[PDB]
């Protein structure tokens, strides 16, 4: 079962690529030393083979949001607005391990050596939340295959073989966004502002001297300057959600998580409002089901997840999490 979630990003997308990268005042990502490099955390990039010129395929950059990131995102919306309301309406109580395994695939960092008995595999695989995301102490396989967010871009013409041939962006899709820290005690100005600090003006003054003693001279003070590379907004992305012999309840759960997908953020940089997005279209095995009012279609999936929400107990999450 194949799902293709085509979205447009309202705010810019920052999913931080690990790597202490550096930036100058105008471009030159990771310059040579002595040009006064500034710290730079770039957005997550996937190298991708692409048709660069006629007959030549090169490994080129393309900035993505990771499939692991949005696997955990889909699992998170699934659990916060469907699963947790079900377990509050029936009063079912999860354990610490059951909660942590339902959100993270494991209760501890040690998976168990034994494999689960086949009845437990069949019952858990049949269960929609467990089937979509496996794991646990006995390392269950899940039915969900969450692919990364590629933009609809020339670097992904080799990726989008079927469909999405139009709406192709030629140029780069990143902008460097600069954030500075400022010290408020440097910027306060007035003593009527410092009448709310206990200790008066002399305490604020003494902190100014601490920072002056740091300015002459490794406890970090304040007032840093940073840049972070972001993916530019308004561009169409594609999400691929593949399923592995799914029950109708698992697909209905995915569509239940998918309808509210917009409230959440496909990114990091929470405070900067990075990750806001609107779903342009959703296709089940290629068929378009998406409307402005969520998903229009797939009624057997919605009915199956309706009957699977009912009778969903905590004990499924408890038994799977419990280590041998």
């Amino acid at each position: 079962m194949q799902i293709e979630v085509t979205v447009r990003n309202i705010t810019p997308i920052f999913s931080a690529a690990p790597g202490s990268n550096y930036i100058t005042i105008d471009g030159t990502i990771n310059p040579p030393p002595g040009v006064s490099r500034f710290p730079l955390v770039r957005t997550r990039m996937m190298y991708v083979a692409a048709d660069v010129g006629d007959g030549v395929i090169k490994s080129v950059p393309l900035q993505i949001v990771p499939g692991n990131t949005m696997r955990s995102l889909l699992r998170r919306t699934m659990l916060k607005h469907v699963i947790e309301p079900a377990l509050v309406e029936k009063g079912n109580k999860l354990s610490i391990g059951a909660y942590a395994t339902a959100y993270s695939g494991n209760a501890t960092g040690n998976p168990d050596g034994v494999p689960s008995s086949f009845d437990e595999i069949a019952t858990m695989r049949a269960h929609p939340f467990i089937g979509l995301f496996g794991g646990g102490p006995r390392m269950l396989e899940g039915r969900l295959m969450v692919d990364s967010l590629y933009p609809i871009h020339t670097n992904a013409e080799r990726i989008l073989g079927a469909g999405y041939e139009n709406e192709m962006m030629s140029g780069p899709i990143t902008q460097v966004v600069w954030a500075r820290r400022m010290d408020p005690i440097l910027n306060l100005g007035s003593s009527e502002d410092v009448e709310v600090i206990n200790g008066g003006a002399v305490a604020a003054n003494g902190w100014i001297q601490d920072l002056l003693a740091n300015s002459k001279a490794n406890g970090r003070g304040l007032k840093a300057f940073n840049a972070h590379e972001v993916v530019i907004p308004g561009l169409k992305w594609v999400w691929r959600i593949s399923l592995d012999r799914p029950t109708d309840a698992q697909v209905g759960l995915v569509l239940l998580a998918l309808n509210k997908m917009t409230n959440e953020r496909i990114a990091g940089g929470h405070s900067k409002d990075y990750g806001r997005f609107v779903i342009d279209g959703v296709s089940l095995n290629g068929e378009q089901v998406w409307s402005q009012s969520g998903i229009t279609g797939g009624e057997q999936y919605f009915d199956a997840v309706a009957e699977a929400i009912d009778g969903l107990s905590s004990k499924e999450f408890e038994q799977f999490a419990q280590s041998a």
């Binding site: 440097l186 306060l188 003593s191 002399v202 003054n205 002056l212 002459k216």
Partner: protein, 234 residues
């Protein structure tokens, strides 16, 4: 090399010379040696050094600035800044509700290279006349022009040699004109005054890329402006 500027804001404007007098009077009872370092006194006596002043007080729109030239002067500002800040903090917390004193710091490198085209550099409040001979040169424009030429040049070479970097010795300067003529008093309510030029314009073939102080009474805060700020700017 580099010159350090440290800016102190009392919430009110204080002139550079009376700030120098206030800094002298505030820490006089205790911490005398730091004052000797700040004011370029002799190590043994109270009188000042005849050489270039590594540490010179400067204007600030909300108070006073300190300029330290070279590694030694920057170190003098580095060891002098918090004690000086603490002194104005206790002085301005003793009377009134109290004010909060805010600072800034900046390490500007100095540089120069010769260019085959003249460049317009203005200066404000630069002293020029100190003796009766200097008055006699100032009466006639022909003999006053070359005196101002030599004064501007020898100030550039002096603060070069003091900062520890080499200046090309083929520079040709020129002086176009000054907007006003005014006197400078060393101490208030003294009959002695010294002549000074206001908004003088000089033209040098080379470029200057730092803080460059010209003429007499440099530690009092006269005749320095930042040559980086004027550069390509009107």
């Amino acid at each position: 090399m580099f010159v350090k500027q440290v800016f102190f804001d009392l919430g009110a404007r204080i002139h550079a010379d009376e700030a120098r007098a206030l800094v002298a009077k505030l820490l006089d009872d205790t911490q005398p040696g730091l004052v000797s370092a700040l004011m370029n006194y002799m190590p043994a006596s109270k009188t000042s050094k005849t050489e270039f002043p590594l540490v010179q007080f400067s204007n600030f729109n909300q108070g006073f600035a300190l300029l330290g030239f070279g590694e030694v002067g920057a170190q003098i500002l580095s060891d002098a800044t918090p004690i000086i800040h603490d002194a104005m903090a206790k002085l301005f917390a003793s009377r009134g509700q109290g004010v909060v004193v805010q600072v800034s710091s900046r390490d500007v490198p100095l540089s120069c290279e010769k260019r085959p085209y003249g460049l317009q550099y203005t200066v404000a409040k630069m002293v020029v006349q100190k003796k009766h001979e200097h008055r006699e040169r100032l009466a006639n424009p022909e003999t006053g022009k070359v005196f101002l030429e030599g004064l501007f040049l020898r100030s550039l070479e002096r603060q070069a040699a003091a900062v520890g970097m080499v200046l090309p010795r083929d520079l040709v300067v020129s002086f176009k004109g000054a907007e006003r003529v005014s006197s400078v008093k060393l101490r208030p309510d003294s009959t002695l005054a010294h002549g000074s030029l206001r908004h003088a314009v000089f033209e040098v073939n080379a470029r200057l890329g730092g803080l460059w102080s010209v003429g007499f009474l440099l530690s009092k805060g006269f005749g320095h402006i930042n040559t980086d700020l004027q550069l390509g700017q009107g």
